[PDB]
Symmetry: C2
Subunit: 194 residues, 2 copies
């Protein structure tokens, strides 16, 4: 059968854990990954004779930033190029959070977008046309009860290979790694911290 990985990605405080715990049925465990030293929650799911591992990556603001979390996410993506990036956006904060999605899109990753808290957003009169957003992005977009339709898009995206994706992704993260390398070099060489 197949073995594939989903990276759950978005900005912080976006309901990511809850969706994660639902998707992995509460049975996620912590684990150590190559390229990073922090521990991450992941859970494995059997679908027929196929397996998918879902990893909850910490919320971040800029894919090309240098906070600890952003470095973690970038190193994880570089070293463990997931088969699908599942990007969770907060429907109520859509204007602020689109930037992360678009940055990920620029890597040419395989992406599905879940617009979370769609009801609460309606209460502020916020309406999103999923179909039009989807056609502009050329990425599937689902509003969360929408769960079933999302799952359908998730499993669909896992059935096909993405030849050359890993090399595209690594390439597009290069300018950030050059900066990290400069930083280590300069600090090691020119700065003493107690």
């Amino acid at each position: 059968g197949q073995f594939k990985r989903i990276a759950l990605l978005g900005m912080p405080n976006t309901g990511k854990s809850t969706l994660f715990n639902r998707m992995t049925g509460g049975a996620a465990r912590v684990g150590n990954w190559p390229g990073i030293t922090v521990e991450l929650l992941s859970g494995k799911i059997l679908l027929g004779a196929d397996m998918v591992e879902i990893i909850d990556l910490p919320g971040i603001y800029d894919l090309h930033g240098f906070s600890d979390d952003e470095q973690v996410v970038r190193h994880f993506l570089h070293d463990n190029v997931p088969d699908l990036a599942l990007v969770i956006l907060n429907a109520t904060q859509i204007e602020r959070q689109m930037s992360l999605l678009l940055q990920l899109k620029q890597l040419n990753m395989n992406i599905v977008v879940l617009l979370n808290m769609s009801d609460e957003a309606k209460q502020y009169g916020i309406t999103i046309d999923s179909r039009k957003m989807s056609e502009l992005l050329q990425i599937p977009v689902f509003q969360l009860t929408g769960y079933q339709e999302a799952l359908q898009a998730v499993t669909r995206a896992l059935r096909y290979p993405t030849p050359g994706m890993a090399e595209n992704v690594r390439t597009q993260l290069e300018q950030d790694e050059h900066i990290e390398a400069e930083m280590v070099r300069i600090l090691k060489s020119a700065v003493q911290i107690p």
Copy 2:
């Protein structure tokens, strides 16, 4: 008429340095490419009057806070002759990234390491000559002390402008502008966000 953009994270002493540099004679002003107002004034460096602009403190050059959009738009449409980058010496590990992001733009830069006595008090030692050698950017330390040496470095940095510099800076900023343009296009077509009532 030659422009110096003060760039740095919040709480790096930028505004106190600004006020000292412009004699408290700063005024608010409008600039091409931005919808907000900025403080700017003049300083006599050598024989030329130079305009100094205080950009709001930011954490990430490629982030999407309001202040980070302002900085990028200002820089794109008003490429300074010098970016005067102020880092807090006590946070050198956490602030170096903003400097290196600006360096990647190919801006003309001078670095000032402020709060140098505070850093020394906490046992943080910075070899500014070494750091300068490694960056290939002038680096000077401020406490009061270091101010005149800083102004001299700024003056020299305005000599011999590098041909093609502005064109390179704009180019390096336009992927950020493509993301922003995509955001605008998508919000207008697919999202309704009503103001209150």
